[PDB]
Amino acid sequence: KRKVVLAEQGSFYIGGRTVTGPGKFDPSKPVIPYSNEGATFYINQMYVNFQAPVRPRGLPLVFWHGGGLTGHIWESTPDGRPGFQTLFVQDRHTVYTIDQPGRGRGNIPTFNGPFGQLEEESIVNTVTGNSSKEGAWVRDRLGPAPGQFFENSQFPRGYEDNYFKEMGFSPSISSDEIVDAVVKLVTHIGPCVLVTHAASGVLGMRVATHAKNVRGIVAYEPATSIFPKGKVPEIPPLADKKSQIFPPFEIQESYFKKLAKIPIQFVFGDNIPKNPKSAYWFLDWWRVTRYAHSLSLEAINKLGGQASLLDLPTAGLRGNTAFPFTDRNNVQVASLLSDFLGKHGLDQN
Amino acid sequence: KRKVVLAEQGSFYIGGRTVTGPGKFDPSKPVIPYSNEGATFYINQMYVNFQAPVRPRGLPLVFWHGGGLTGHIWESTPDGRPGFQTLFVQDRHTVYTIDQPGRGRGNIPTFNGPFGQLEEESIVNTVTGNSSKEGAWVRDRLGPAPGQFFENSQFPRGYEDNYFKEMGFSPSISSDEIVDAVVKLVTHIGPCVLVTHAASGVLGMRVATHAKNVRGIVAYEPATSIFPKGKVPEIPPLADKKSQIFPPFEIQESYFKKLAKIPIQFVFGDNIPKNPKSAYWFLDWWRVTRYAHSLSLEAINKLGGQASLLDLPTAGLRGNTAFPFTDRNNVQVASLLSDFLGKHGLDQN
Ligand SMILES: CCOc1nc(NC)nc(NC(=O)NS(=O)(=O)c2ccccc2C(=O)OC)n1
Ligand SMILES: CCOc1nc(NC)nc(NC(=O)NS(=O)(=O)c2ccccc2C(=O)OC)n1
């Protein structure tokens, strides 16, 4: 069902700061080409979209895209099926979707001069990085190599171009400033639930430690593990005996303990190997990253928490990629998210 | 005023091309940091959002943001009132809103290396340009100088931070490729109406000459005038005796003549001076730019066209900025757009 009844919808900007150019602005002088003279620039602000149903129940959901992505991934699948935005408005939740600072409708901080440079100050780096189609194919576990699908894949085959077109670079905005923008949104919204993805997994955990309004977290395929400072457990290298997973983020235990106060679920798709896989770097990377997360969740539970790991194949769902919420079985994935919300009273007023 | 009922909503990517790096991709080697080796990159694609009401009447509308903007400006005003997207879904049109290539959820073409550079190929320039708050203030005619408002302004005063946060830079993607993406969208949609703004004014005129599915154009404060090649009229320099308006775009007459086959309306807000204003560069720029547009429309009409210029003050609306569709009286501005659609039957099936 594609029908949606909205009590209200819209979008707004929140967060960010300003930086200023030298000198002063004279309205008599030519304004184009643009100049940094007398300039105030708003930087690192975030775009926020909301849709509210009639008669909402439970807490609003904040959907937070993964690395190099935008709120598009919650709007629609690459083959044009409804995304989680529609599904959960239909499930009677108010739904927020964001484009974080540096992505999509969020701000890209650049000026008049080499990319990211304001006179002598580097606001973000001029040198960018960006995944290729090939890198994203194996990162997202469509298959073991570009152009090849796992036999069981839930990916919407035939819509590869549409899928990869949604991805792009991120400028070097500090993670602190990205977290700051979402903390400010959570302050504005009130009690809510964060639903994160890959790169935004660790960022959402950080937000919750700064914002008691976060009443629950569901993280799809989180990319970076988090631990109390000085208590990172032994994590093996990858099967190539050369590479490591992403260095785990370390926070003061007084902040880490806040994660034990809310229900947290990490969700993983399929085709993560059980055993070392030296021929396929990202598959092996996901094996060790998932392992590190299991230990992170265990640490939260030793502090009295309620942190769980859901492998979708254990729930009867086979073949999901690293984007289970846009896969062909996304309605079933959504049902499992509704189950988590219902278990924890997050779908009741 | 806020309730909206959608038969369906969603988003998708369209247009663009691919560029490739050197070499071959090896899935056994570390995928992060990302590399251009063996890489395929999707570049210059466009993001498209659609909202369809139940039982649409008349043609779909394609809202095309101005320079440095995104589809946000059609979603909500800076103070959170409904934008034209909501207003015209309520008016029973299917509504498309785009983020053009290079803006918002559209692609920003950059790779692993200095911004915009793929090995030895410069896809877009590493040196960017971007407006300041101060430049945008006078560009958009909030007032004659930053901090000042014209009397009777319809700007949503107090929401300056929200407003300027929606603006940003555009990489040097060729205008040809931006036009190409929207031609592809118009082919996909079928007969439609383009609603353009400032920088997308001339781009929408170009699309219409390439796409018979464009059945009408309403252009809010277009920034560049368009003429048949070799027949640009005499246009005076600005009052500073030094500057000129944007060089008018010239197209072959065979293509220009296609503009005479559809209704076209240019819409201007308030406070464009009638006489030279040497003290206020952008006010004088708008005076001469609007004059050039009056000549462009007269050229369309001499070829048998249906082109008109609507000054909102002549319709009884005073104080509009260069973004009349997000001003305080935007409902009244919308009513005038509904009037144009009804006059030409573009609101009937
Ligand atoms: C410690 C990080 O260091 C680092 N350095 C560089 N270059 C120096 N690049 C990166 N890139 C990413 O993290 N990519 S990623 O896209 O966010 C991602 C990665 C893994 C798994 C998933 C994702 C993801 O979100 O899939 C949607 N990371
Ligand atoms: C032939 C132009 O050459 C040129 N050169 C440079 N730098 C060398 N910069 C520009 N910038 C713009 O055109 N800005 S603009 O934002 O699109 C714009 C302008 C005027 C009026 C309105 C707008 C606008 O859309 O307001 C939302 N133009």
Author numbering:
A (entry chain A), B (entry chain B): 12 to 360
Copy the relevant paper text.
SulE catalyzes the de-esterification of a variety of sulfonylurea herbicides, such as MM, BM, SM, TM, TrM, EM, and CE, to the corresponding herbicidal-inactive parent acid. The structures show that SulE is a dimer with a lid loop in a domain-swapped β-hairpin covering the active site from the opposing monomer.
To elucidate the catalytic mechanism of SulE, we solved the crystal structures of wild-type SulE in complex with CA, mutant S209A in complex with MM, and mutant S209A/H333A in complex with MM, SM, TM, TrM, EM, BM, and CE in the range of 1.29–1.63 Å. In the six structures of S209A/H333A bound to MM, EM, TrM, CE, SM, and BM, the ester O atom is hydrogen-bonded with the main chain nitrogen atoms of Gly78 and Ala210, forming an oxyanion hole. Furthermore, the aromatic ring of these seven sulfonylureas is also well-superposed, indicating that this moiety strongly interacted with SulE. However, their sulfonylurea bridge and heterocyclic moiety are not well superimposed except for MM and CE, implying that this moiety is not tightly anchored on SulE.
